Design an enzyme around this catalytic site. Structure first.
Site, PDB file in Angstrom:
ATOM      1  N   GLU A  87       0.824  -1.199   0.000  1.00  0.00           N
ATOM      2  CA  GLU A  87       0.000   0.000   0.000  1.00  0.00           C
ATOM      3  C   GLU A  87       0.863   1.256   0.000  1.00  0.00           C
ATOM      4  OE1 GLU A  87      -3.353  -2.327  -0.254  1.00  0.00           O
ATOM      5  OE2 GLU A  87      -2.913  -0.241  -0.740  1.00  0.00           O
TER       6      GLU A  87
ATOM      7  N   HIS B 163     -15.448 -11.595 -11.794  1.00  0.00           N
ATOM      8  CA  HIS B 163     -15.118 -10.643 -12.848  1.00  0.00           C
ATOM      9  C   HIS B 163     -16.018 -10.804 -14.064  1.00  0.00           C
ATOM     10  CE1 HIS B 163     -11.691 -10.393 -10.249  1.00  0.00           C
ATOM     11  NE2 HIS B 163     -11.090  -9.487 -10.998  1.00  0.00           N
TER      12      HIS B 163
HETATM   13 ZN   LIG Z   1      -2.536  -3.041  -4.503  1.00  0.00          ZN
END
Ligand SMILES: [Zn+2]
Ligand SMILES: *[C@@H]1O[C@H](CO)[C@@H](O[C@@H]2O[C@H](CO)[C@@H](O)[C@H](O)[C@H]2NC(C)=O)[C@H](O)[C@H]1NC(C)=O
Ligand SMILES: *[C@@H]1O[C@H](CO)[C@@H](O)[C@H](O)[C@H]1NC(C)=O
Ligand SMILES: *[C@@H]1O[C@H](CO)[C@@H](O)[C@H](O)[C@H]1NC(C)=O
Ligand SMILES: *[C@@H]1O[C@H](CO)[C@@H](O)[C@H](O)[C@H]1NC(C)=O
Ligand SMILES: *[C@@H]1O[C@H](CO)[C@@H](O)[C@H](O)[C@H]1NC(C)=O
Ligand SMILES: *[C@@H]1O[C@H](CO)[C@@H](O)[C@H](O)[C@H]1NC(C)=O
Ligand SMILES: *[C@@H]1O[C@H](CO)[C@@H](O)[C@H](O)[C@H]1NC(C)=O
Ligand SMILES: *[C@@H]1O[C@H](CO)[C@@H](O)[C@H](O)[C@H]1NC(C)=O
Lengths: 643, 588
Positions: free
Chosen positions: B350, B480
């Protein structure tokens, strides 16, 4: 009790010469292998010192009261510790305060009191025949000392006090100064073997003590000691012998010296820069060696006299608390301007407030502006984002320096900017601060356009309403507390300093002094610096002018800022002086050429005064031969060093 | 005046409104994501509505400038990214039918009732750990027979509507509209087609096939022991034994297929528990790793505004690890950090997304994005790839100093990474070639299930345990596929992930194999990376790639180099067993 000594033969006073004596360390910084110039109170080289004896043979127990002009060089040639101290004061009679520095057989005593000194102060050493011993018996210096402010007594010692028979064995040199309430003492001791006069040589004195006495010394008197034995028959006032000793007194003047520091940090040599033209060229070249040639020196030298600074008498503080702490700062597109005039304004506290993110100045040094004179000062205060503060500078571009606020290249002001997130951001947005976004053309330096013309960005006539291709040119900043540094509100204040022919109005702060005439003095009028004789002028100018300038554009007539008179300026004197030297390696003999004298405005006449179209030449013999040119003098005249 | 000069004025007027409406929407979304309460949903919807209506009108305005006159190439990109009609080109009547279809598909997948068991964590836990042959067959067939059965008729209408929408926007089919991200036009020498993506996706997979065939034969030969007489050495792996409901990741197979069982791995949870890491030190260590590689520090507002620890039961917030870039110089990280090595890795991942978002903050509003869709995750992954090597944990206080490493550990590690990385490439490639074939129209409507299970056996080597007729819809089960997302981003993320790592390991002058290369304390590599992070989207992705690796196309050679020791060890292990498979054997 005080006793007036009798049986002392009176003789005329004697004088001698100081051979490069009386040099002391000016400050307390270590220097090595360097030539350093310093201006201070020194004993001039080859001066005329007064000479005093204590020789029995005549008696001649000399102890006159002497002047204390600007500080004293005191030298003492001794072998038997006769010179014991001094008293410094003004009247020396218990109406004023006096300083006693005495060395009694056991201690060193420094006192500042109201003394009733004796008319003839002295110390007494007595010698016993039955057991060979010299001991101190008498201390006859003062009657009473009442109000004592400063006192010091040193640790106890035993001194010799024995009478010696050889020649003088100890030279003790002291320098005494009285500046800003401090009595400063420098000293040095040297072994010698001589009989009379002040010896040759060089030795720098080192700082000894610095007493905070706070009194007005004008005169001083030396304290000596006496010898009494069985061979000294009489009463108290006549039964006394003397013991040989000698001391020398000289007076200090403000001079510029070139001191030499060797690789160990000691002053080994010095040049008195105002003794001779030769010494002046040594001082200019900053060397002790001069090569053969002709050198320009300077006009008649009256020496340093006194320094004056003259500033307008205006003691009102400038509203710097109103521009910076203003309640409401103004949008950048319509900024504000405040002209501060007739005010004495301090900037150092503003500089050190240390709340500023950016404080930069252009065309003005940051510290010099503290003492300068301008005709007016402006202050332009607004608010921008943090990222565009870079555009507030000469020669920058962007949406701020093109359509909002344009600065010229020759800027004489100071840009100050500080973050103000706390005051003028709030949750949900602070949409008050508008800024122009679209403009047909760039803004001339210091011009404000606050119109709301509809930007016709294309070809169609816009008719006065927005829509497609007609854009309103003012767009509003959005400030919030959570933004980054780059998007956070900075308040900016731009100071500008302008100078015109008008009488100065922003000058300060700096206290002024008195005005003196007929001497060659240093002066500071409204930030202008100069060295010359100031003379009263029976002349006038037009009301809008302050200075007068000649063909070379130097200032010749400077108006005083307090009384609005016109004061003319003449250099120390008005002459042309040149020096001819065969080289310091070869000789010390020199010739001097005065370019504006027809042979008297000369330093010395001597002999061999010869007139050329280059001027009056003093110190050279004129011959009827014609050789090749060795040293050019001018107008066909040359010089050489021959047999 | 000229269209280019009038366009630069329109975009100057645009970016100023856009920045503020975007930040006003991001703040209102963060407020609900950290405070999952009432009244916050309404502000979320209002701030997401004003942005949408403003962007719709500003896009209607953008059309009036013809795009042929503009020659700047930067204003060309902003106006290209603004002038796209999107779905509004469809008529009014069928746009609500299409959005109804989308809503129904998402609802029919999210709430699946198998009886009663839902998906999370009802069927997922059965599929991931049952290790019983028939229980996992029931848990597989039920989903494929309910959630895939209710989506069959709808996907047939979703295909034709999306196809007509893509045909109206001057593309050929919806597959081309998806493929159009990897397209560069007008930059001589750097051009890229939409027909070029199909190629290179084939000449890169046909180059990784041997490692997959040896990994497959090793996994099958180790799976024959567990389920005794259900797998055959010549045949393929049935679909319910691959350690996942969809057989997407083989990670759950690592509990069985351990090469060297006795040796453990570098689990450092106890090392951080011992020294009492307070759920904030982890992010400081991440910041110091980035500071040391050469990049700038964290902004101050990150430390105060961001939420880095679950607020407790009094305040509930959904916390899936995320990095937020709200514009106007505001960055935040949303994670429920807990003391575990997993959160020590995700913190660097992150933080690498946050460091990518700070780089291109200088670009205009429309060019503040990654060079293409497969660049953010490669950047976020290589940092978690370097911050995991034992040398780095040895540099940090934990991982007690001596800890000599042996090869028998590095094989365990490599195989645990291979099951994750090189096991999902033939599934991504097969799924995204099926959807391209169906969208183009190559597969008629009567061959949707008959051709899927012929792609499976020839590409993924996975047979079905019960035959599915034409009525079923198997691919629509995947998240998806039903929720209408792209899928080729995961085939290119993996390749970029290792070409970046090779180039930056080379620039650090490391010597030796790549699996233990580290980047910290190498300023040059950090400058090399920041020279491409800075561009943003303003430059073609081939030029952005050339600034780091040195090539204009994606390669697979570094990925193969990373796995060379594993490949050799597997090539020696399998020689007793078989290699490759056969399409005939079916369990039924
Ligand atoms: Zn990521
Ligand atoms: C990068 O260099 C720094 C130097 O500042 C290394 O930090 C040292 O790490 C060792 C290992 O525990 C400590 O004992 C030292 O106290 C640290 N500081 C210094 C100044 O040496 C850091 O380990 C290096 N990076 C890597 C991956 O080794
Ligand atoms: C402005 O206000 C501050 C805070 O009261 C004060 O310290 C400062 O002296 C004031 N004036 C200036 C010029 O900063
Ligand atoms: C102050 O300056 C003014 C100048 O006009 C002068 O008239 C006045 O006497 C001065 N005051 C002093 C020097 O005390
Ligand atoms: C969460 O929302 C509720 C709803 O009003 C509010 O009272 C509470 O203060 C919010 N949480 C925080 C941390 O502000
Ligand atoms: C395009 O315009 C920008 C300013 O909007 C300018 O900086 C850039 O150089 C232009 N492109 C070219 C190729 O000149
Ligand atoms: C969007 O639709 C309008 C409607 O006429 C059309 O003119 C425009 O070209 C379309 N945009 C694109 C990119 O085709
Ligand atoms: C930025 O990082 C350097 C290196 O660690 C550090 O010395 C400095 O204090 C940091 N500054 C800020 C504002 O974080
Ligand atoms: C390396 O790994 C192999 C794999 O089984 C093992 O046999 C060998 O002992 C290990 N060490 C060395 C030095 O080869």
């Amino acid at each position: 009790q005080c006793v007036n000594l009798t049986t002392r033969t009176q003789l005329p006073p004697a004088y001698t010469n100081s051979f490069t004596r009386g040099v002391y360390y000016p400050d307390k910084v270590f220097r090595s292998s360097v030539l350093h110039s310093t201006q201070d109170l020194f004993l001039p080289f080859f001066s005329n010192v007064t000479w005093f004896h204590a020789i029995h043979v005549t008696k001649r127990f000399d102890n006159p009261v002497l002047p204390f002009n600007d500080g004293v060089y005191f030298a003492s040639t001794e072998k038997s510790n006769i010179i014991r101290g001094w008293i410094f004061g003004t009247t020396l009679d218990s109406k004023t305060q006096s300083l006693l520095i005495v060395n009694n057989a056991t201690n060193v005593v420094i006192k500042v009191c109201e003394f009733q000194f004796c008319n003839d102060p002295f110390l007494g050493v007595y010698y016993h025949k039955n057991n060979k011993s010299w001991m101190e018996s008498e201390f006859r210096v003062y009657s009473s000392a009442n109000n004592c402010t400063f006192e010091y007594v040193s640790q106890p010692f035993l001194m010799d006090l024995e009478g010696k028979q050889g020649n003088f064995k100890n030279l003790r040199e002291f320098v005494f100064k009285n500046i800003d309430g401090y009595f400063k003492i420098y000293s040095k001791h040297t072994p010698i073997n001589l009989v009379r006069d002040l010896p040759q040589g060089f030795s720098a004195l080192e700082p000894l003590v610095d007493l905070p006495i706070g009194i007005n010394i004008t005169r001083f008197q030396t304290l000596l000691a006496l010898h009494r034995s069985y061979l000294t028959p009489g009463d108290s006032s006549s039964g006394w012998t003397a013991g040989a000793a000698a001391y020398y007194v000289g007076y200090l003047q403000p001079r510029t010296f070139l001191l030499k520091y060797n690789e160990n940090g000691t002053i080994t040599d010095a040049v008195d820069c105002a003794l001779d033209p030769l010494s002046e060229t040594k001082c200019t070249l900053k060397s002790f060696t001069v090569e053969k040639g002709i050198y320009q020196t300077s006009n008649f030298r009256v020496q340093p006299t006194e320094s004056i600074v003259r500033f307008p008498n205006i003691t009102n503080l400038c509203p710097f608390g109103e521009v910076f702490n203003a309640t409401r700062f103004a949008s950048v597109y319509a900024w504000n301007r405040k002209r501060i005039s007739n005010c004495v304004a301090d900037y150092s506290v503003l500089y050190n407030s240390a709340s500023f993110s950016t404080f930069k100045c252009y065309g003005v040094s940051p510290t010099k502006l503290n003492d300068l004179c301008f005709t007016n000062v402006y202050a332009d205060s607004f608010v921008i984002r943090g990222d565009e503060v870079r555009q507030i500078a000469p020669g920058q571009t962007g949406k701020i320096a093109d359509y909002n606020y344009k600065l010229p290249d020759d800027f004489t002001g100071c840009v100050i900017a500080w973050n103000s997130n706390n005051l003028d951001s709030k949750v949900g947005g602070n949409y008050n601060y508008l800024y122009r976004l679209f403009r047909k053309s760039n803004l001339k330096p210091f011009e404000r356009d606050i119109s709301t013309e509809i930007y016709q960005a294309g070809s169609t006539p816009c008719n006065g309403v927005e829509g497609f291709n007609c854009y309103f040119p003012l767009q509003s900043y959005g400030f919030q507390p959570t933004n980054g540094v780059g998007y956070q509100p900075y308040r900016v204040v731009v100071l500008s300093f302008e100078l015109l022919h008008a009488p100065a109005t922003v000058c300060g702060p700096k206290k002024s002094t008195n005005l003196v005439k007929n001497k060659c003095v240093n002066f500071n009028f409204n930030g202008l610096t100069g060295t010359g004789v100031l003379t009263e002028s029976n002349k006038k100018f037009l009301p809008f002018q302050q200075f007068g300038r000649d063909i070379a554009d130097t200032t010749d007539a400077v108006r005083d800022p307090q009384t609005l008179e016109i004061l003319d300026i003449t250099p120390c004197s008005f002459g042309g002086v040149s020096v001819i030297t065969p080289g310091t390696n070869t000789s010390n003999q020199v010739a001097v050429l005065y370019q504006d004298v027809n042979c008297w405005r000369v330093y010395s006449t001597g002999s061999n005064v010869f007139q050329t179209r280059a001027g009056c030449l003093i110190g050279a013999e004129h011959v009827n031969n014609s050789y090749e040119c060795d040293i050019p003098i001018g107008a066909g005249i040359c010089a050489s060093y021959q047999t | 005046s000229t269209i280019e000069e009038q366009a630069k004025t329109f975009l100057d007027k645009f970016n100023h409104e856009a920045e503020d409406l975007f930040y006003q929407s991001s703040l209102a979304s963060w407020n609900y994501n950290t405070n999952i309460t009432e009244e916050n949903v309404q502000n979320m919807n209002n701030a997401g509505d004003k942005w949408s209506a403003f962007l719709k009108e500003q896009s209607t305005l953008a059309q009036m400038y013809p795009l042929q006159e503009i020659q700047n190439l930067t204003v060309k990109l902003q106006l290209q990214a603004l002038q796209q009609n999107g779905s509004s080109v469809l008529s009014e009547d069928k746009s609500k039918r299409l959005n109804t279809i989308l809503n129904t598909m998402s609802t029919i997948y999210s709430t699946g009732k198998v009886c009663c068991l839902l998906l999370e964590p009802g069927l997922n836990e059965i599929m991931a750990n049952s290790l019983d042959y028939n229980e996992r067959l029931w848990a597989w067939e039920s989903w494929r027979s309910e959630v895939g059965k209710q989506l069959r008729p709808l996907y047939e209408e979703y295909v034709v509507l999306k196809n007509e929408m893509a045909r109206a926007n001057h593309y050929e089919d919806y597959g081309d509209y998806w493929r159009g991200d990897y397209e560069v036009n007008g930059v001589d020498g750097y051009d890229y087609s939409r027909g070029q993506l199909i190629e290179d996706v084939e000449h890169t997979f046909e180059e990784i096939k041997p490692l997959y065939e040896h990994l497959h034969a090793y996994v099958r030969a180790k799976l024959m022991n567990a389920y005794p007489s259900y797998i055959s050495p010549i045949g393929c792996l049935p679909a319910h034994l691959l350690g996942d409901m969809w057989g997407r990741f083989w990670t759950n197979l690592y509990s069985l297929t351990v090469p060297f069982g006795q040796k453990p791995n570098i689990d450092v949870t106890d090392a951080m528990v011992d020294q009492a890491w307070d759920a904030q030190r982890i992010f400081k260590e991440a910041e110091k790793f980035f500071v040391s590689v050469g990049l700038p520090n964290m902004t101050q507002g990150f430390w105060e505004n961001s939420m880095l620890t679950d607020p407790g039961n009094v305040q509930k917030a959904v916390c899936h690890p995320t990095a937020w870039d709200l514009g106007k110089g505001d960055f935040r990280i949303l994670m429920c950090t807990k003391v575990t090595m997993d959160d020590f890795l995700t913190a660097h991942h992150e933080m690498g997304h946050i460091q990518y978002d700070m780089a291109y903050a200088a670009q205009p509003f429309l060019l503040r994005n990654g060079a293409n869709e497969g660049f953010h995750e490669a950047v976020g992954e290589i940092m978690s790839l370097s911050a995991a090597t034992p040398k780095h944990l040895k540099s940090i206080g934990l991982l007690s100093p001596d800890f000599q490493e042996d090869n028998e550990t590095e094989i365990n590690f490599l195989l645990k990474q291979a099951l994750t990385i090189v096991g999902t490439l033939p599934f991504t490639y097969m799924l995204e070639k099926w959807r391209w074939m169906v969208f183009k129209g190559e597969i008629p409507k009567d061959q949707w299930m008959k051709k899927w299970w012929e792609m499976k056996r020839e590409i993924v080597g996975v047979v079905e345990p019960v035959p599915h007729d034409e009525t079923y819809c198997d691919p629509a089960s995947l998240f998806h596929v039903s929720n209408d997302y792209s899928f080729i981003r995961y085939y290119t993320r993996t390749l970029y992930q290792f070409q970046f790592q090779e180039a930056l390991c080379q620039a650090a002058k490391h010597e030796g194999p790549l699996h233990k290369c580290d980047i910290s304390n190498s300023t040059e590599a950090g400058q090399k990376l920041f020279n491409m992070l800075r561009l943003g989207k303003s430059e073609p992705w081939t030029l952005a790639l050339e600034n780091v690796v040195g090539a204009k196309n994606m390669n697979v050679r570094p990925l193969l180099n990373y796995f060379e020791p594993l490949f050799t060890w597997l090539k020696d292990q399998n020689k007793n067993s078989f290699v490759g498979w056969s399409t005939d054997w079916s369990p039924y």
